[PDB]
Design a binder for this molecule. Structure first.
Ligand SMILES: [Mg+2]
Ligand SMILES: [Mg+2]
Ligand SMILES: [Mg+2]
Ligand SMILES: [Mg+2]
Lengths: 312, 258, 256, 313, 255, 349
């Protein structure tokens, strides 16, 4: 994703980031990045064990997940780098443990993260859950981080509101796009010149890199080799994503046998557990009709206790 | 600054008992108005709306507004030391880090006072717009308690079916199902403090008994509860506190999606 | 298909609280004659027998005998949803899938109704033969119930002894032993009466008796029938509707 | 026994008689009149006094009937000048052989003072045994609360019949005392009866004038002559206050059979088919193992199983 | 030979309930004069003084002095078998191997009699010389019981501060601190529910609530409890028993 | 001390000997033998195998000893009162004047195994001035110390009797020859040796042997003190019945004795029996003991500084010294009401 972005925000617009508890997300439908997710678990039954447990925990708290996969990758920086020199096996093994649990899945036309955003900005889902801030660049209004973390790592989920980011940085999405690029995009080389905080300011009085370049020009702040500061700015805008309305995700009921006869058996693993597991997943289904108060009352804000003096 | 003397101390005791079990901690918004408090359950499917008009206190005095962060449970514990008939008296300093409670037995032979630690806390608020509802059922608060409890043993989801005739609570579960049905005993005046319904249109919403059974913890606060309902909108279970306030619980419906 | 209306709702409540802890599931025997229920405890060392005559119901109608398999604990819960003063009505269709329990309230305002799901159950039945015990004690339900409770604190086995004018439950244990002598009354409230032919001294497990006593609210008085080396019969009469008996096999004594 | 007491009770008082299958007597302790039993055993169709008591006892065992055999003591003075002059037997000192077997089988046996059923009834009364076992009904007249007949007499296989003394008295409207005179009147083993009197009449005569003496006076037209020197007062006393055991000094206990010894004694000394004894002995040691905890299963027959009616979804 | 017939068994039922939990076993010092019992807890921190004068038994016959080793708890169970209104009778013979308790219920036809196994035991003793106290407090047995029960929910130890005007109990702990001041019941002069304070000089000591809420179990025995303290000396919590005796608890201060 | 004493009591009647644990001594004051301790400490870290140098090196036992030990005490609720000896009584023999008995100075010259070259502990009577070295640690530690008139053994045993403390902490048994109603040994032990403490209830002794404080002292002197001399042919139990009868070092030398068991020349059994009864013990009153608080740095310096010690632990030592003074300590009822014996259940038969 984007480099040093989280810190930049945290350091200049903390109002757009909140540290909520996994429970507060009850009733929310979220778009996840299966790819990265599947990866997270690895870093070989893990690609599914975590794909199992975690999705159970995400269910147990009322969160309705929709895993997403990538299609035909586009022109990513380090991506086509070895090409300057010239599998889905454990991947689809997951696209199975899912429908066998009654959990949706979608084949993104390219980059899922972009697709996830695509959804989020269509009311089809609440937030997008990845570890890469990219989603924000792609225009996604809400991004949730850590929603796939281990039950152990007691880390709360980190929410990000694009419309609050844009708010503080006083700049449109596009204007925000350029910032991400000069911050360190994984699509094209940034500019050795500008710094995290520095890169912001420039964009603030130069609504584009195209205008930022022609300004500072000495051999003291040179612009990259084959700088596609353009091609990229485009992707972050109009990516390749399956239409939101194209489909309606529906969480089905988990099939205990068919699945447990394709897990503890075909992939060998403690039966007692994956049984109580499928059991729990099936339970969480109960409150899959229970709406949120959000669904009816606008959120007023936050009452904060008065700062306590010192040991008086 | 802040100092409220409330003759009917039982109110605090009773309140903190109703709250402590549905939410573990919260912020008390103190002002010249009175004492107010809002917070939702960790799931955000419901919330408590406590209101104590300063008109009800024997003596009130809040020059500068306050927002006390309070571990409810701790209050519950300290208030359990207050005599059901004592005069509870809250007090707080400007940039207070603790809360002063002073229990006064009327018999003037006993007086307690505890200093409770406060805490830092941020509480997501919600704006409940003033709105009129389709159905409004006033009924024995203890009756509504038994109902929610009993059906909570049949199923964990109840269907409230209000009409001009009467209300019909229904639930269904593993062992079967059951339906309690209260009617408007227009039978002149005989019998119990029966049920009465004011209603524009018949409603029928489903709710999580798990939650209602938390609300009913506020029963000792009013001899009658009132459920306000309107189609596809959250339920309102309200317990009137004396004539100085009230305690409202809000609960999200069951989106019978299709 | 059967439908019964008992204005004394509570009887049913009491009748179940008196069966559940001892047996989990059971079969109800409904006919034109009435309602019965006989089942042993899971260990076959005890057995309960319920009998509710049709003449005892405010209304009773049956046109085809039934047998409903019931998870007593479930029915126990559903009845806990009826106030002690409600008018209970049971109604079950032919190839019944569920049993309907309806609770009408005295203060004409509330009316509850439930459909308890029935189960496939096969309860083994016994033929209890009419016999003449050589010792029959009639006493207060309350007392017998206390005796068994206190005595369960000294030890786990009770030794009931019975002569012509008194009866005696005694039990020994870690902290010692204890005896409780009841002397025959001879008018008064509830008196103890012994109609003894041959003297008796039996041993029984208190654990089991303490279950039998759950049936105490059904009758003010309770009557124990006993003989040599066979079961003890603890009986509670249910108003003018029928009765409830528990039989308990004795604990084998020194004959080795 | 008591001439005709059987049918008489059958008629006039039917609530006293009851026929029941052995099985129903599970767990029930019974006192058996060994002597009467042994003689009855003899008349079969030697070694019958053994063959009998051996098997008849096992069957009892198998159903869970703990029994104690009681042996006659010193015959109380009476005239049984039953001249001899078919199958004429006389059980004499076989006892020892039998007492021996029982000892081996682990079955207890008491030696009574005078009459056996006298004592037997004594045990029943104390509550040291459920009933008394004899074909001789004078056990009732001896006071026995309960008496079951045909528990050894198996020799066909008639059903055990249980007479309840109390009911006999209620039905007839007599009291033990009165009853005894009635019995004597019927046909006692201890003294001639009043010739000509019919069992029925006998009953009336007793309920009318409560006693035998009282009957003689207030009757007697020659038509009803009295036996020669009658010993009815003498008899009546025996039935009432007989010499018996101290039910309290009784120590009833059943031991495990000793297979070895039995085969030695039966299939060794008293030549008997080792196939038969070995197998029988097997049955014995099986029931023998008495359920240290009674399951109502044993005490009551299983009538069947109630099946929850088929359901319609 | 020892025989005590007490018409109001409840006293006994209560007495044991007051002991059972503070001391698992103790030696009953019977005698021609009555029944006494002294003992400390395991820690040698607290002490109980039971005094039941023979004048307080409807029938008390004892010649020689006897001593009985008893498992208070065990004895507490046999006693739970008696009704609050049964007439209990303690009976024990010489070199008694067991204590006999006969429960006569008012239902005349009922007669319970349990034989309790005595034990061999040696219990350390103490001399507590009658001593005047700086401050003493006669207050409702219930009020005191609640204060201790409550403050205990705040801290593990209370600080009693008596003065002419009145006494103040106070704790402190993980969740804030608390104080409970009791004015002297002057105006509300009403015999029983009165809080009177006799004082020489003002005291103030510390005590562990845990040990105090052990003494309170004796509350059902008297409608009023009395605290007697003085600096550096152990606290005495006295519960007078009917008009037949009393039960005293001593607690070692803290510093 | 008094040889055999421990054994006798151990054998004859173990009743007076409890095996309590430190934990259970909370809120209990104690008078420790400052001497008997420091000595103890040194004659411990003596592995008869350690490399020996001509000139004695810089010992750190006494300090490391007083430190970590008086810590565990305070950290257990025990309030110690160390008591250094004073001016020894003019009764040399039995212990003093025994420099001739301290003739291991020559034994340890052989060297040539690792179990006999360790008999260098005799040479470790070097109490020297580790006192002025420990009293410094104590003052910086808070603990109160006292310089008794003479043998601290009795002063401590006095304070106990004077209720000004619970019991005497010394390995030397002669502390019961002074009356100390309670004597507990193995206290100044080693947190690491984890040696359960032992309590000697003087009364429970005399209530098993029969005798009283006067007789007892006869039995002790007769058993072998260190103030005077003792009998020749009689020893431990071999001279207990002789004390239970004739109970008097006078009425003893005149009954049942073929004289083949002669009394030492000018034997001071009389002038000594007096001492072990009226020892030069300080006044219990002017002893206003007062546990204070650590001088912190003054201790880290002196410790890790003048005499190098892991500052990372000396601090961590003084750290766990204060967290042990927090709040307040529970008093023991014992220390308020005098024990008057035990009441015992009648023979259960
Ligand atoms: Mg990426
Ligand atoms: Mg990608
Ligand atoms: Mg005969
Ligand atoms: Mg015969």
């Amino acid at each position: 994703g984007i480099q040093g972005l989280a810190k930049l925000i945290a350091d200049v617009a903390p109002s757009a980031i909140r540290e909520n508890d996994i429970k507060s997300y009850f009733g929310r439908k979220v778009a996840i990045d299966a790819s990265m997710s599947i990866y997270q678990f690895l870093i070989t039954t893990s690609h599914l064990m975590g794909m199992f447990y975690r999705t159970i925990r995400m269910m147990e708290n009322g969160i309705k997940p929709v895993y997403v996969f990538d299609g035909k990758p586009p022109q990513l920086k380090s991506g086509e780098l070895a090409k300057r020199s010239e599998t889905k096996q454990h991947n689809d093994e997951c696209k199975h443990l899912l429908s066998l649990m009654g959990i949706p899945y979608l084949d993104a036309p390219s980059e899922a993260e972009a697709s996830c955003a695509a959804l989020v900005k269509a009311g089809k889902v609440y937030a997008a859950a990845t570890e890469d801030m990219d989603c924000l660049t792609f225009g996604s209004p809400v991004l949730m981080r850590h929603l796939t973390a281990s039950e152990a790592k007691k880390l709360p989920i980190q929410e990000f509101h694009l419309s609050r980011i844009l708010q503080e940085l006083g700049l449109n999405q596009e204007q925000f796009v350029d910032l991400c690029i000069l911050l360190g995009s994984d699509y094209c080389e940034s500019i050795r010149g500008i710094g995290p905080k520095r890169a912001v300011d420039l964009i603030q009085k130069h609504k584009s890199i195209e205008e930022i370049v022609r300004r500072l020009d000495p051999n003291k702040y040179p612009v990259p080799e084959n700088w596609l500061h353009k091609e990229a700015h485009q992707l972050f805008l109009e990516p390749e994503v399956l239409d939101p309305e194209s489909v309606e995700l529906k969480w089905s009921e988990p099939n205990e046998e068919e699945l447990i006869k394709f897990m503890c058996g075909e992939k060998q693993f403690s039966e007692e557990r994956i049984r109580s597991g499928v059991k729990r997943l099936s339970k969480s289904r109960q409150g899959s009709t229970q709406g949120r108060l959000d669904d009816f009352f606008k959120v007023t804000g936050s009452l904060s206790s008065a700062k306590r003096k010192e040991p008086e | 600054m802040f100092e409220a003397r409330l003759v009917q101390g039982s109110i605090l005791k009773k309140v903190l008992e109703a709250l402590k079990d549905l939410i573990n901690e919260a912020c008390w918004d103190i002002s010249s108005s009175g004492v107010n408090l809002q917070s939702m359950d960790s799931s955000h499917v419901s919330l408590v709306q406590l209101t104590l008009r300063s008109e009800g206190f024997d003596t009130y005095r809040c020059d500068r507004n306050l927002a006390m962060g309070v571990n409810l449970t701790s209050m519950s514990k300290i208030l359990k030391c207050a005599g059901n008939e004592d005069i509870i008296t809250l007090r707080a300093e400007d940039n207070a880090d603790t809360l002063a409670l002073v229990f006064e037995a009327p018999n003037q032979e006993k007086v307690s006072d505890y200093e409770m630690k406060l805490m830092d806390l941020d509480v997501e608020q919600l704006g409940i717009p003033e709105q009129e509802y389709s159905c409004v059922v006033k009924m024995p608060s203890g009756e509504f308690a038994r109902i929610c409890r009993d059906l909570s043993h049949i199923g964990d989801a109840v269907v409230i079916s209000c009409a001009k005739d009467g209300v019909k609570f229904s639930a269904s579960g593993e062992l079967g199902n059951g339906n309690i049905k209260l009617s408007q005993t227009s039978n002149v005046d005989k019998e119990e403090e029966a049920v009465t319904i004011e209603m524009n249109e018949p409603v029928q919403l489903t709710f999580a008994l798990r939650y209602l059974n938390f609300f009913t913890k506020a029963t000792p606060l009013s001899s009658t509860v009132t459920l306000s309902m309107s189609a596809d909108v959250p339920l309102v279970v309200e317990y009137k506190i004396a004539d100085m306030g009230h305690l409202k619980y809000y609960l999200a419906p069951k989106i019978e999606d299709e």
